[PDB]
Symmetry: C6
Subunit: 216 residues, 6 copies
């Protein structure tokens, strides 16, 4: 990645063995559970396009997902090229094309040049945005359950049902507003008869905390 | 997080793989036992709002708790906006709204600008305060036992009973004064007959050490 | 903690995930065996009062011990206040009270101010002293055996008996002089008949090495 | 490897125990699965020829593969010598031959001299290129299955078949274009009758995402 | 320990959690096998007397050995005091007594003052010398076997016998010269009849390599 | 070891706990398999003679091998003394004898003086050369199989036979030329009848890759 040294300068630093192993192990253990995306984003802080490709390429399994990710990257690259056409002056910085942002046709030195320019052309952040769009699509595709099928069991603690409900909603990746709206609507409808009766009596505008206390 | 470099300057540094893994594993192993809060606070030393969201977002389970935390954050954000209304000068620092402190509508660069300003607007510390308020509520909600049900078993060593008593009191999160007051009151009443007789004979003003020695 | 940077300046540094985990695991594995105290002291080198509270607060179990520690800290704080009364000048350093040394009513910045002052008011070292006094009391309380009950078994190797003897003496925390004096007195009396006869024949002034060789 | 210090200078640094262990363990666990190549490239960032030989020499097993790699390196070295003949001025930098790039007849100091020259003669990057050519050949040789034998089982989830298909294609190392072309051709032909009927109905130009959704 | 910073200055640095854990685990796993001494010496590189006491005090078991070590330290301290009598000028460095070198009556700051003086009074190196003398005595005491009882079994590979022979000799801690002399004398006499006949035929001046090849 | 700091100066640095543990564990797990030598060389990058002795002395087992290594070191030391006789000027650097290079009669400060001199007298690199000569002899001695006994089993995959063949050749440590020559000679002769017939038909000058493909 590109980090700050002590004369305040932005310099390249090798991706660390700790970072590499952390990402490989997170994919092995969590596959494409939603929390893998924020872990990817944190582990790739300051990454060049080369670093991002390294992280993705070091994944051994899940090649269906990785092929879908390549399709998404290429689509985002194509839209980049449409909005930002390109074309060389001796010793001058050229403009990155989509494939340069994705690190396929650009060199590490070109990537460092763009990222450390004034003003910086943040090819790492742009590429990471495309990758996260792709991973989100994979997370949704690999979501095992529809929120419509998350219903509280007759003897299931309300807390465990709510955990399942919002876990599913996260993989299904509804908005943060919908997740705030299902509290008074779908969460109540999918509760079991005993808790539903209690939740109905709480009235409108009950917080999640109040609902969970009531059915505790 | 934001740390000091060697020309004494406050600079951004990537959240480390060690920090990320430590938090994920602490939640997996301890869930919302009370000691998780001071671990969270220590692991997030110097954190930006982005770093705090990373830590919370990397948690895979417990989505009922994480949704309750979002509600608490939004409430604290709303109170921030009520006390601190907002509203742009070219190239000047704008004032953070509640959602900016929570890192949802602010960029990393804006967060760094506020935290490293003179005087600093410590959006990381403000947001961490809101998160800890939320986690405390979760710790209390997930406390499995009332202190009224912690009673010494007929053959239970007094030390083991006291461990259970103050463990429960901590999750129930009574004040630090009440924890000092239950020593002469509820701790004695919930002891078994044999130790209670001994504790009654010690008289008023006995320290916890003296009570534990007496019933040892 | 507070450490030295390269322009020779004393600066604050975040407590590391390694340090935090090491302490948590040492308590989990060793509880309050005597060797935990020197480990605590080493892991808290340079600690602020905040860091010391973090270490103590991250302990999940043993809440009877942690409550006893709080009592000891409050007693030491009260004695501090009696010897050092307090009381504000704009922008000037105030004097720490007992609760400020214990980090309950002082901020991190105040703690850094005191510790890095010229001359420094070492609130971290003062607080650590109080904590160690408390931990010592806990180690003694949780010592499972009196030295009077450590007696060599008829077939127990002398080395194993001596290990048990000085292990118990350490938890019972006799002086370093008494530990040097029991060599010729209690260690011999509690040996088994066969070794005792040999030890009696060595005469006065025998070293531990000589006694262990003789009964080997 | 060669890294940047703080006066901006390119200096040699010892290969770290973390790097050494990571590579040894990656070979032990993954053998020559395709993802081992990008891990090798990332772990050898900035490596001198000495460092590259260290990494290869620390591998204990797989000596058939390592002997094949030596053959490939020697072939690339021979082509280097053909394109770049060589031949000494007192205290002047000599030109590297193939065996010097491979680190067999060059010293560490000569390697540092070339890599840190202005302009740099990047013997580490040149040698790494030769090694990766060799590893690719090994990955292909050790690929256990032809893509022609990857056919969806009657009850095999389409996702699992696609994982196997592109995993095999990766080891077989078809182009990135062919991997984009097999989506509409071989992937459909090797699907089971039920999914094939669905995929045929999607029509031409279907994305991998659309095909996987259709057969989900 | 005391280490060099970048303005070339000798400064104190906290003992690291890695160092602390490494020593504790080496004692737990190896007890007082001879190789523990060089590990102790390496882990305590640059240590102050405080650091050395920390390492010794963090050991939980083996209190018979640790008490013997204290006796040896006190003996060496007494000899120090006899050779180097002591006795204060305001703000001047006093001379260390034996107990100051052992870190019992000296402060960390006094220790740093002596170690970083010009010329340095290396109290850490002096104390480490005393500790190693004590550990050597313990290693010898805890040596389980006399070299006289190491005899090659009728079917024992010569290599395994030689491993046992020099392992025992190391714990018994004969000189490095004796270990070179037993090659032609005791090593042959304690071999089994079949190898002894072969070794006798090699003649005088045979190297260990030649003896091991002959009986292989 | 001796490393570069930031004013470009060669300074001593303590051997790290990571390095120490890595070497100890490599010997425990791999004994004297050939790949242990390049691991030793990499882990001892920049080592002083003291560091090299530390690494060798921390090995607990294999004392027959370590005694053979001492013999080899002494032989190389004797040859050093024969080629480089020695013999003192006040405050001047003396010339190292064989035992000084091996770190037995030299101090750390003398070692640092020689290694950081201009021009440097690289006692660490010279001593490491002697140690590697000794380890190579041990690797050969402990090689369990002659290459003459590595023959392909009737049903053994050719790849597995070639792995065994070059693994044995490596321990037997034939030249790198012989390893290139056995490809067309001994590798074919020791193959099983079925593969041998195929290999004979390939003709002269077949590469290892071609032979392995043919018998795959």
């Amino acid at each position: 990645p590109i980090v700050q040294n002590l004369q305040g300068q932005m310099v390249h630093q090798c991706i660390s063995p700790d970072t590499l192993n952390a990402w490989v192990k997170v994919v092995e253990e969590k596959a494409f559970s939603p929390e893998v995306i924020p872990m990817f984003s944190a582990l790739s802080c300051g990454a060049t396009p080369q670093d991002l490709n390294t992280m993705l390429n070091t994944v051994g399994g899940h090649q269906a997902a990785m092929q879908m990710l390549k399709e998404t990257i290429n689509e985002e690259a194509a839209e980049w090229d449409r909005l930002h056409p390109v074309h060389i002056a001796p010793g001058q910085m050229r403009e990155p094309r989509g494939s340069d942002i994705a690190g396929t046709t650009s060199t590490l030195q070109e990537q460092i040049g763009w990222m450390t320019h004034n003003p910086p052309i943040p090819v790492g952040e742009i590429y990471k945005r495309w990758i996260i769009l792709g991973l989100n699509k994979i997370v949704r595709m690999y979501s095992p359950t529809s929120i419509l099928d998350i219903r509280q069991g007759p003897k299931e603690p309300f807390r465990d049902y709510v955990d399942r409900f919002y876990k599913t909603l996260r993989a299904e990746q509804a908005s943060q507003e919908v997740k705030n709206a299902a509290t008074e609507t779908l969460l109540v409808q999918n509760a079991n008869p005993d808790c539903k009766t209690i939740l109905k009596a709480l009235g409108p505008g009950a917080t999640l905390e109040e609902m969970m206390t009531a059915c505790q």
